[PDB]
Ligand binder design. Structure first.
Ligand SMILES: O=c1cc(O)n([C@@H]2O[C@H](COP(=O)(O)O)[C@@H](O)[C@H]2O)c(=O)[nH]1
Ligand SMILES: O=c1cc(O)n([C@@H]2O[C@H](COP(=O)(O)O)[C@@H](O)[C@H]2O)c(=O)[nH]1
Lengths: 215, 215
């Protein structure tokens, strides 16, 4: 990923989202689009972004349903032009497999969300996260998400998935995570508010990249 | 809920979804709309259904993100006209609270998904589900979802949430659950494929209701 930095584009207005993404496009090659934008502007926003910016799009849909519904969600998401989809592992192996099957058929990728970055992840997800990661490995998952806010957990995640697997990490900036420390373990960092709420998003992105280059 | 039966409308085509919902409208007063339909036809489908059928709409979006993103998802969903939203408890109390805060502000309801109905729920969710339910009670949640496929787990869920709380239950029909047994513990059952894939959905719905009335 260009500069190891993925923009989390969670503005809810098409005009604001396009403005900020355009301002920072020189510093990224990958945009994570989630439900805040999609549910406000429609699934057509994915193909609009892919065309206008020539970026890769990861659909962060935190997919967390039964296998049959997961199948339908992934089909709709890839039809809309997404390059990859984020899928929760907590619901279990059959729900993850359903997503992997659709990605295989459609020539796309699944990212497995292991531990989440916010405080409430400590209640239930953290105690299952090592096993969720090991399930991922067993299923042949090659792309994972884990938390910038807990680099010791990110290290343990990396330990389970190996060096060949690709690991991206949210929680940098607003949630308290640090770019450089997170990039000790993750291949790329996800950054939302620290860039898209900044008075100057391009300057915020540039500032992050300057600290990344220094690594 | 009319006849204690909620239609899970997971067809992906607006014309098919409207046809089937119209055919069974005399037997329900509540439709669960999820991502298969929304991501295929847009969020405007919610207000279309609410107008055309005068039904209540539960948005089954299995909300499973960090508090700030959950807030945005709930805001977009209620703006679209949903009466209630389904929210995972597995991510923890702060993520659930975020949804409860938006529901309070917008005069809507949150349903907390405890244990899921599919086989993979046994891996991670089932071992946390009692505690997820108890978290719900502590947060003041009054509406819950639990699995038709495991009535002993549905009983234990009901035990935790009490008789005043409202409990709806998917997994009836296609996934192997039974209407009558599930209604021993749940207030209403959710049914998707057994109705919407039937050669005659109205006859399928009527058949279910006839077995419900007999209880
Ligand atoms: O564990 C996770 C999983 C996520 O998807 N995310 C998502 O990553 C982004 C984080 O953005 P921000 O930099 O504004 O905190 C948001 O889109 C959030 O929904 C996260 O923060 N933590
Ligand atoms: O534990 C759960 C949670 C769900 O939301 N669901 C949803 O309830 C519906 C079940 O439909 P069906 O009757 O076709 O199996 C689907 O929309 C599914 O996504 C479920 O089956 N089990």
């Amino acid at each position: 990923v260009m500069n190891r930095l993925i923009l989390a584009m969670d503005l809810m207005n098409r005009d604001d989202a396009l403005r900020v993404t355009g301002e920072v496009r020189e510093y990224i090659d990958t945009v994570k689009i989630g439900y805040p934008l999609v549910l406000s502007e429609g699934m057509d926003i994915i193909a609009e972004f892919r065309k206008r910016f020539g970026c890769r799009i990861i659909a962060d849909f935190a997919v967390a349903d039964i296998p049959e519904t997961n199948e339908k969600i992934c089909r709709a998401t890839f039809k809309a032009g997404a390059d990859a989809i984020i899928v929760h592992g907590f619901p279990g192996a059959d729900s993850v497999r359903a997503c992997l099957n659709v990605a295989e058929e459609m020539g796309r990728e699944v990212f497995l969300l292991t531990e989440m970055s916010h405080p409430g992840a400590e209640m239930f997800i953290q105690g299952a996260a090592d096993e969720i990661a090991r399930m991922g490995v067993d299923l042949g998952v090659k792309n994972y998400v884990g938390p910038s806010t807990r680099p010791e957990r990110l290290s343990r995640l990396r330990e389970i998935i190996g060096q060949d697997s690709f690991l991206i990490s949210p929680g940098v900036g607003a949630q308290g995570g640090d770019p450089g420390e997170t990039l000790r373990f993750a291949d790329a960092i996800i950054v939302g508010r620290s860039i898209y709420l900044a008075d100057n998003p391009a300057a915020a992105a540039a500032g992050i990249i300057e600290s990344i280059k220094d690594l």
